Amino acid sequence: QWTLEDFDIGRPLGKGKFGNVYLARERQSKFILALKVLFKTQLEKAGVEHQLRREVEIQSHLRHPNILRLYGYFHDATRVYLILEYAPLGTVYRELQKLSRFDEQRTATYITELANALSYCHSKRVIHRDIKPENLLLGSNGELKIADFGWSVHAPCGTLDYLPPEMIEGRMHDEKVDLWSLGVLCYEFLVGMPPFEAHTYQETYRRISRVEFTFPDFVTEGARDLISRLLKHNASQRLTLAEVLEHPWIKANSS
Ligand SMILES: Cn1ncc2ncnc(NCCc3cnc(NC(=O)Nc4cccc(C(F)(F)F)c4)s3)c21
């Protein structure tokens, strides 16, 4: 039954649309964690109070080294606080801006670690639906840790960039949506920008719908194959996580 007075609030770890993330310390144990501060008025305004309660429920069951822990939550009067595992090496979004693009060795490792986290998620029938660089964090030893199960549902906001055709059209969708997103991620890791980037929402809609993307000259055939086999309009055709993990290019470049 946590209260704010139990925690030493430290430095900001990031700013979000719904609230801010701060580094924190549990006064008794001296344990280092992260506290995301959400406003209650903001949550009730967009009608997502149930989604947050669903996220906490989903995260109370999941345990995996490539999934950022959510320990529980508390509120006072005006704000809601999420007790979170701290990811010392920040976001992948930030690492991507810092390095422009990743090499194949780093990319494959991230895809391998993501696939594992998704494999564990999909087996428990949990679909993430929001796989993007800003929702991927890096642990002490540089491992990928997936976070933000707010838009997660059971089997079967920002830009549209990572959302599959079935999701952007407002149709039915299963575990295969995390596979399209994984494909999109793999492309942005190597290229530096997502395959369907546009200056307008409406153009991005056209690109995703018709699956209109190209590869720059530096992308290898092994990466070209993987991404192409993932980015398919037909959800039931897309490669499985097991095939992704056993993919020649993935096996070659992964650690
Ligand atoms: C930036 N950063 N740098 C280091 C670092 N280390 C640990 N954590 C960080 N950041 C927080 C990561 C999150 C994990 N889970 C989240 N969950 C969430 O934000 N849920 C959520 C929010 C608003 C609205 C809704 C609702 F209701 F709409 F569903 C749901 S955010 C870190």
Curated annotation (Swiss-Prot):
Tagged with keyword 4Fe-4S: no
Catalysed reaction, written as an equation: L-seryl-[protein] + ATP = O-phospho-L-seryl-[protein] + ADP + H(+); L-threonyl-[protein] + ATP = O-phospho-L-threonyl-[protein] + ADP + H(+)
Domain of life from the UniProt record = Eukaryota
Q: What induces this protein's gene, according to its Swiss-Prot or TrEMBL record?
A: expression is cell cycle regulated and peaks at phase G2/M.
Chain residue numbers at which the record places covalent cross-link Glycyl lysine isopeptide (Lys-Gly) (interchain with G-Cter in SUMO2): K132
Q: Where in the cell is it found?
A: Cytoplasm, Cytoskeleton, Microtubule organizing center, Centrosome; Cytoplasm, Cytoskeleton, Spindle pole; Cytoplasm, Cytoskeleton, Microtubule organizing center, Centrosome, Centriole; Cell projection, Neuron projection
Describe the inactivation phenotype.
Answer: Death at the blastocyst stage due to mitotic defects and failure of cell proliferation.
User: What modifications does the entry list under PTM / processing?
Assistant: Phosphorylation at Ser-209 decreases the kinase activity. Ubiquitinated by the anaphase-promoting complex (APC), leading to its degradation by the proteasome. Ubiquitinated by CHFR, leading to its degradation by the proteasome. Ubiquitinated by the E3 ubiquitin-protein ligase complex SCF(FBXL7) during mitosis, leading to its degradation by the proteasome.
Protein keywords: ATP-binding, Cell cycle, Cell division, Cell membrane, Cell projection, Cilium, Cilium biogenesis/degradation, Cytoplasm, Cytoskeleton, Isopeptide bond, Kinase, Membrane, Microtubule, Mitosis, Nucleotide-binding, Phosphoprotein, Proto-oncogene, Serine/threonine-protein kinase, Transferase, Ubl conjugation
Task: Write out the GO MF terms.
Answer: ATP binding; histone H3S10 kinase activity; protein heterodimerization activity; protein kinase activity; protein kinase binding; protein serine kinase activity; ubiquitin protein ligase binding
The UniProt entry's coiled-coil ranges are: none
Q: Which residues form the Protein kinase domain?
A: 7-250
Question: What EC number(s) is this enzyme filed under?
Answer: 2.7.11.1
Name the job this protein performs: Mitotic serine/threonine kinase that contributes to the regulation of cell cycle progression. Associates with the centrosome and the spindle microtubules during mitosis and plays a critical role in various mitotic events including the establishment of mitotic spindle, centrosome duplication, centrosome separation as well as maturation, chromosomal alignment, spindle assembly checkpoint, and cytokinesis. Required for normal spindle positioning during mitosis and for the localization of NUMA1 and DCTN1 to the cell cortex during metaphase. Required for initial activation of CDK1 at centrosomes.
The protein's name in its UniProt record: Aurora kinase A
* Biological source species: Mus musculus (Mouse)
Its lineage reads: Eukaryota, Metazoa, Chordata, Craniata, Vertebrata
